[PDB]
Design an enzyme around this catalytic site. Structure first.
Site, PDB file in Angstrom:
ATOM      1  CG  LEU A   1      50.866  42.537  26.906  1.00  0.00           C
ATOM      2  CD1 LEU A   1      52.250  42.762  27.521  1.00  0.00           C
ATOM      3  CD2 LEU A   1      49.844  42.258  28.006  1.00  0.00           C
TER       4      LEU A   1
ATOM      5  CD  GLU B   1      41.000  46.141  19.768  1.00  0.00           C
ATOM      6  OE1 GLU B   1      40.250  46.998  20.287  1.00  0.00           O
ATOM      7  OE2 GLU B   1      42.232  46.090  19.999  1.00  0.00           O
TER       8      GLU B   1
ATOM      9  CG  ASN C   1      29.301  46.967  20.984  1.00  0.00           C
ATOM     10  OD1 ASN C   1      29.230  46.504  19.842  1.00  0.00           O
ATOM     11  ND2 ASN C   1      28.887  46.297  22.056  1.00  0.00           N
TER      12      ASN C   1
ATOM     13  CB  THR D   1      29.628  38.134  22.444  1.00  0.00           C
ATOM     14  OG1 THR D   1      28.626  38.974  23.023  1.00  0.00           O
ATOM     15  CG2 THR D   1      29.821  38.528  20.975  1.00  0.00           C
TER      16      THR D   1
ATOM     17  CD  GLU E   1      27.461  42.898  22.426  1.00  0.00           C
ATOM     18  OE1 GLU E   1      27.760  43.206  23.597  1.00  0.00           O
ATOM     19  OE2 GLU E   1      27.730  43.626  21.446  1.00  0.00           O
TER      20      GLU E   1
ATOM     21  CE  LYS F   1      33.992  37.293  19.583  1.00  0.00           C
ATOM     22  NZ  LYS F   1      35.246  36.637  20.090  1.00  0.00           N
TER      23      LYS F   1
ATOM     24  CE  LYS G   1      34.267  46.424  27.054  1.00  0.00           C
ATOM     25  NZ  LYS G   1      34.372  44.926  27.016  1.00  0.00           N
TER      26      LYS G   1
ATOM     27  CD  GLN H   1      28.702  54.141  34.928  1.00  0.00           C
ATOM     28  OE1 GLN H   1      28.729  55.328  35.257  1.00  0.00           O
ATOM     29  NE2 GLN H   1      28.991  53.733  33.694  1.00  0.00           N
TER      30      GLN H   1
ATOM     31  N   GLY I   1      23.000  52.999  16.928  1.00  0.00           N
ATOM     32  CA  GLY I   1      22.565  51.627  16.684  1.00  0.00           C
ATOM     33  C   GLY I   1      22.439  50.752  17.923  1.00  0.00           C
TER      34      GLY I   1
HETATM   35  N1  LIG Z   1      32.953  41.644  28.045  1.00  0.00           N
HETATM   36  C1  LIG Z   1      31.974  40.722  27.928  1.00  0.00           C
HETATM   37  O1  LIG Z   1      30.910  40.726  28.593  1.00  0.00           O
HETATM   38  C2  LIG Z   1      32.070  39.538  26.949  1.00  0.00           C
HETATM   39  C3  LIG Z   1      30.819  38.704  27.084  1.00  0.00           C
HETATM   40  C4  LIG Z   1      30.847  37.481  26.119  1.00  0.00           C
HETATM   41  C5  LIG Z   1      31.835  37.154  25.274  1.00  0.00           C
HETATM   42  N2  LIG Z   1      32.986  38.039  25.288  1.00  0.00           N
HETATM   43  C6  LIG Z   1      34.225  37.679  24.562  1.00  0.00           C
HETATM   44  O2  LIG Z   1      35.159  37.243  25.502  1.00  0.00           O
HETATM   45  C7  LIG Z   1      36.501  37.452  24.980  1.00  0.00           C
HETATM   46  C8  LIG Z   1      37.309  38.231  26.004  1.00  0.00           C
HETATM   47  O3  LIG Z   1      36.555  39.413  26.372  1.00  0.00           O
HETATM   48  P1  LIG Z   1      37.134  40.470  27.414  1.00  0.00           P
HETATM   49  O4  LIG Z   1      36.028  41.226  28.020  1.00  0.00           O
HETATM   50  O5  LIG Z   1      37.917  39.770  28.478  1.00  0.00           O
HETATM   51  O6  LIG Z   1      38.087  41.476  26.585  1.00  0.00           O
HETATM   52  P2  LIG Z   1      39.227  42.460  27.042  1.00  0.00           P
HETATM   53  O7  LIG Z   1      39.040  43.754  26.334  1.00  0.00           O
HETATM   54  O8  LIG Z   1      39.175  42.665  28.548  1.00  0.00           O
HETATM   55  O9  LIG Z   1      40.650  41.786  26.700  1.00  0.00           O
HETATM   56  C9  LIG Z   1      41.079  41.461  25.343  1.00  0.00           C
HETATM   57  C10 LIG Z   1      42.326  40.920  25.438  1.00  0.00           C
HETATM   58  O10 LIG Z   1      42.816  40.432  24.113  1.00  0.00           O
HETATM   59  C11 LIG Z   1      44.099  40.943  23.855  1.00  0.00           C
HETATM   60  N3  LIG Z   1      44.246  41.160  22.412  1.00  0.00           N
HETATM   61  C12 LIG Z   1      43.633  42.062  21.571  1.00  0.00           C
HETATM   62  N4  LIG Z   1      44.028  41.938  20.279  1.00  0.00           N
HETATM   63  C13 LIG Z   1      44.944  40.895  20.300  1.00  0.00           C
HETATM   64  C14 LIG Z   1      45.708  40.273  19.265  1.00  0.00           C
HETATM   65  N5  LIG Z   1      45.636  40.663  17.977  1.00  0.00           N
HETATM   66  N6  LIG Z   1      46.549  39.224  19.623  1.00  0.00           N
HETATM   67  C15 LIG Z   1      46.607  38.844  20.954  1.00  0.00           C
HETATM   68  N7  LIG Z   1      45.949  39.358  21.975  1.00  0.00           N
HETATM   69  C16 LIG Z   1      45.109  40.399  21.589  1.00  0.00           C
HETATM   70  C17 LIG Z   1      44.195  42.239  24.674  1.00  0.00           C
HETATM   71  O11 LIG Z   1      45.595  42.573  24.900  1.00  0.00           O
HETATM   72  C18 LIG Z   1      43.417  41.894  25.975  1.00  0.00           C
HETATM   73  O12 LIG Z   1      44.192  41.275  27.048  1.00  0.00           O
HETATM   74  C19 LIG Z   1      36.283  38.158  23.618  1.00  0.00           C
HETATM   75  O13 LIG Z   1      36.461  37.326  22.466  1.00  0.00           O
HETATM   76  C20 LIG Z   1      34.877  38.742  23.766  1.00  0.00           C
HETATM   77  O14 LIG Z   1      34.288  38.915  22.456  1.00  0.00           O
HETATM   78  C21 LIG Z   1      33.166  39.228  26.034  1.00  0.00           C
HETATM   79  C1  LIG Z   2      30.211  52.221  29.093  1.00  0.00           C
HETATM   80  C2  LIG Z   2      28.761  52.583  29.395  1.00  0.00           C
HETATM   81  C3  LIG Z   2      27.771  51.782  28.982  1.00  0.00           C
HETATM   82  N1  LIG Z   2      26.409  52.033  29.215  1.00  0.00           N
HETATM   83  C4  LIG Z   2      25.392  51.083  28.742  1.00  0.00           C
HETATM   84  C5  LIG Z   2      25.395  50.706  27.268  1.00  0.00           C
HETATM   85  C6  LIG Z   2      24.920  49.222  27.273  1.00  0.00           C
HETATM   86  O1  LIG Z   2      23.506  49.093  27.152  1.00  0.00           O
HETATM   87  C7  LIG Z   2      25.323  48.751  28.671  1.00  0.00           C
HETATM   88  C8  LIG Z   2      26.598  47.923  28.715  1.00  0.00           C
HETATM   89  O2  LIG Z   2      27.602  48.556  27.863  1.00  0.00           O
HETATM   90  P1  LIG Z   2      29.078  47.930  27.696  1.00  0.00           P
HETATM   91  O3  LIG Z   2      29.795  47.730  28.965  1.00  0.00           O
HETATM   92  O4  LIG Z   2      29.835  48.785  26.752  1.00  0.00           O
HETATM   93  O5  LIG Z   2      28.790  46.425  27.135  1.00  0.00           O
HETATM   94  P2  LIG Z   2      28.069  45.845  25.850  1.00  0.00           P
HETATM   95  O6  LIG Z   2      27.955  46.950  24.877  1.00  0.00           O
HETATM   96  O7  LIG Z   2      28.794  44.689  25.305  1.00  0.00           O
HETATM   97  O8  LIG Z   2      26.626  45.259  26.370  1.00  0.00           O
HETATM   98  O9  LIG Z   2      25.572  49.929  29.479  1.00  0.00           O
HETATM   99  C9  LIG Z   2      26.006  53.187  29.918  1.00  0.00           C
HETATM  100  O10 LIG Z   2      24.834  53.468  30.160  1.00  0.00           O
HETATM  101  N2  LIG Z   2      27.058  54.007  30.342  1.00  0.00           N
HETATM  102  C10 LIG Z   2      28.443  53.794  30.136  1.00  0.00           C
HETATM  103  O11 LIG Z   2      29.238  54.609  30.578  1.00  0.00           O
END
Ligand SMILES: NC(=O)c1ccc[n+]([C@@H]2O[C@H](COP(=O)([O-])OP(=O)(O)OC[C@H]3O[C@@H](n4cnc5c(N)ncnc54)[C@H](O)[C@@H]3O)[C@@H](O)[C@H]2O)c1
Ligand SMILES: Cc1cn([C@H]2C[C@H](O)[C@@H](COP(=O)(O)OP(=O)(O)O)O2)c(=O)[nH]c1=O
Ligand SMILES: NC(=O)c1ccc[n+]([C@@H]2O[C@H](COP(=O)([O-])OP(=O)(O)OC[C@H]3O[C@@H](n4cnc5c(N)ncnc54)[C@H](O)[C@@H]3O)[C@@H](O)[C@H]2O)c1
Ligand SMILES: Cc1cn([C@H]2C[C@H](O)[C@@H](COP(=O)(O)OP(=O)(O)O)O2)c(=O)[nH]c1=O
Lengths: 346, 346
Positions: A37, A83, A86, A123, A125, A163, A198, A203, A284
């Site tokens: 959490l 976590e 980025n 991911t 990335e 990651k 995100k 937006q 970056g």
């Molecule tokens: N956002 C994306 O588009 C995306 C795309 C591909 C892969 N991933 C991967 O998917 C997974 C989940 O991504 P997300 O977007 O749902 O993240 P998120 O930020 O929405 O949620 C992360 C969750 O992990 C928990 N957490 C953090 N540190 C912790 C710890 N030490 N112990 C236990 N719980 C902990 C947080 O409380 C939270 O509920 C990650 O491993 C991420 O790298 C994310």
């Molecule tokens: C958070 C944010 C991201 N972005 C851009 C940066 C990235 O190219 C794209 C998505 O960013 P983000 O949601 O942080 O995801 P990730 O870095 O894993 O791809 O959107 C904006 O233009 N404005 C914003 O306010």
């Protein structure tokens, strides 16, 4: 083929969506969520479905004693905890090192001890960057113009680097100790319950709050969008039918540049096409991401169902509009944090 | 000689101590501060002769942020050798590898970022994984991809190689994200004076001198690319002073040989029957063949190895261990006993 699974990070965006998937389609499975959490964890993402099928345990995946207690009673671990932003990793990499690497290691040793199934959620990335289609001879369709299971690792930031590092030890634990693990690398997810820090939800909610949307630079960067519901079915397919030791790429062939995505959001919400601010670009910053998901489709028969981005985005906008109490308490704090490092370009 | 006050981590070990001696003898304008924890592998005797106004030994952990900050505040470069370096130990207990190889590198990177100083990461060819034997390759080892290059994919097999590969990845991400002034080197198997007796070549030599039979894993078909530590030292110096920021360089002297033929040469040089050895339990996940293409370093930096005659190099090494038995005799019993816990004659 599993009856008692542990889902780490299950109170977050992608993880909570997976828990809902299991609760609805596999009622014979018991789910134990382990979540710390952090700022990204939210009990509201699970409150309505907690009961005999789903339980929540608040804790750290790096807490060996707690992980051992839970692992002794499970037959599989699906690992989402991390976590994930980025921009946060550039301000303070500390928690990324702790959770993403040390946390994965702690879970791997528990899986090894009890000899149970482990699926590592990762991911796209980890593979680094790709050039825009306009600068490629195959226009993005040629060999090497998309990420594949054979692409080399080359992460750009503290987030993607930690990651990628976790991916490496999972594979080493399979070859060295025979851990029953699989790995998935997925493209950018979108949908209900995504934190407002995100891109897409930031937006949408800024507009609902009377705040201008924010675009990094001129928005040339490209992301391959996939609805979280399709990520859920892909992980389930790998968990139950995948080959031990293999890595699978998840994607829905939905590349779009940030500028066109923002313009679509503005249009759908009845705003002027130029009602937004250009802001300080990310250090970056990765150019283009693109996933070739042929392996998963061919071997396991997985097929994405939400391939119409326009409709998926329309439904996502409506969800944030219908559930404003879910994010309103966080809007001021998130935008204030961004103001510390981003300003309007002019 | 652009750097006048450098820190050499792990300088009390095998490769690191040889580098410090190289600097003392060839670059008199440089002051050296060695940071070493003195684990089972660290030995003050490896530096004793040159300790004084020019070289100082500070006993400590690279993960100790407070101590690292104190030392980094007065240096203009960090050459990083500190690490848990033995695959066999990593298979028995991965804990110290996670701590030192990954967390340790992270700690040093943050210090280099804070003070904005030069950083050179010393790594291994094992991060690339394994290669087939030459007799099983279409190009007999001379074709594209039949040797490791700077473009080869990371694919580590063990806790040791995966933690090293993980450290390589965060070094690169810190360069792209924060502008850290770092370079990376990946080298083949080193041999020479002062190597711990747990390693292959020294273990066989000292076993013979102690009246113990050499030990060969399996049939000994595995191949390793040998390089004398003195050539590794000059390679690191060239990269440190002339290397392009953010680039990776491979160090090798084109000396591929299988374990079996190396052991036989040792027995021959020490007047022993060709069958005076024992076959033992093979290593889990054991890597087959390692081979390095050092074209980038040779062509771009003008570096050339001086010890290309393995037979002569090995002769001098056997002589060193023969004239310095007091240096290792006390550890012989303990090392072989530890091995007996997982190794038996087959
Ligand atoms: N956002 C994306 O588009 C995306 C795309 C591909 C892969 N991933 C991967 O998917 C997974 C989940 O991504 P997300 O977007 O749902 O993240 P998120 O930020 O929405 O949620 C992360 C969750 O992990 C928990 N957490 C953090 N540190 C912790 C710890 N030490 N112990 C236990 N719980 C902990 C947080 O409380 C939270 O509920 C990650 O491993 C991420 O790298 C994310
Ligand atoms: C958070 C944010 C991201 N972005 C851009 C940066 C990235 O190219 C794209 C998505 O960013 P983000 O949601 O942080 O995801 P990730 O870095 O894993 O791809 O959107 C904006 O233009 N404005 C914003 O306010
Ligand atoms: N032996 C080889 O053939 C070889 C080949 C290629 C690359 N490398 C790399 O070269 C470097 C040095 O290898 P080596 O053979 O000389 O190793 P080594 O075992 O001889 O010495 C390691 C040294 O680091 C010190 N150390 C360990 N943990 C530490 C910590 N937390 N803080 C400070 N010091 C610590 C030890 O006390 C010891 O002096 C490593 O990074 C290794 O991965 C080794
Ligand atoms: C230590 C040892 C190694 N070996 C083999 C295993 C490896 O293929 C090779 C070198 O092993 P080692 O010195 O441990 O180096 P590395 O794993 O970093 O290459 O020698 C033996 O056959 N017997 C031994 O007693």
């Amino acid at each position: 083929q599993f009856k008692n699974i542990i889902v780490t990070g299950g109170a977050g965006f992608i993880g909570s969506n997976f828990v809902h998937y299991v609760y609805n389609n596999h009622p014979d499975v018991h789910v134990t969520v382990l979540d710390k959490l952090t700022y990204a964890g939210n009990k509201a993402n699970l409150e309505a479905i907690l009961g005999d099928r789903v339980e929540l345990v608040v804790g750290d995946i790096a807490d060996a004693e707690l992980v051992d207690k839970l692992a002794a009673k499970a037959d599989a671990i699906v690992h989402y905890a991390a976590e994930s932003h980025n921009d946060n990793s550039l301000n303070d990499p500390s928690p990324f090192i702790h959770t993403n690497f040390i946390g994965t290691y702690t879970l791997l040793e528990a899986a090894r001890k009890y000899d149970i199934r482990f699926h590592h959620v990762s991911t796209d990335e980890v593979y680094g960057d790709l050039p825009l289609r306009e600068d490629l001879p195959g226009h993005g369709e040629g060999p090497g113009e998309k990420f594949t299971a054979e692409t080399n690792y080359n992460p750009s930031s503290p987030y993607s680097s930690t990651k990628a590092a976790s991916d490496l030890i999972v594979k080493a634990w399979v070859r060295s100790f025979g851990v029953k693990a699989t790995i998935s690398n997925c493209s950018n997810n979108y949908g209900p319950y995504q934190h407002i820090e995100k891109f897409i939800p930031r937006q949408i909610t800024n507009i609902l709050a009377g705040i201008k949307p924010k675009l990094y630079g001129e928005g040339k960067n490209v992301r391959d969008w996939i609805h979280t519901n399709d990520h859920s079915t892909g992980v389930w397919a790998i968990l139950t039918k995948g080959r031990m030791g293999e890595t699978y790429l998840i994607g829905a062939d939905g590349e779009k540049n940030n500028k066109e995505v923002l313009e679509l959001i503005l249009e759908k919400m009845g705003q002027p096409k130029d009602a937004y601010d250009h802001v300080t670009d990310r250090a970056g910053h990765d150019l283009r991401y693109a996933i070739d998901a042929s392996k998963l489709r061919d071997e396991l028969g997985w097929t994405p169902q939400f391939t119409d981005f326009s409709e998926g985005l329309e439904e996502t906008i409506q969800w944030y509009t219908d559930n404003q109490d879910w994010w309103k308490a966080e809007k001021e704090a998130v935008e204030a944090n961004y103001a510390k490092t981003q300003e309007v370009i002019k």
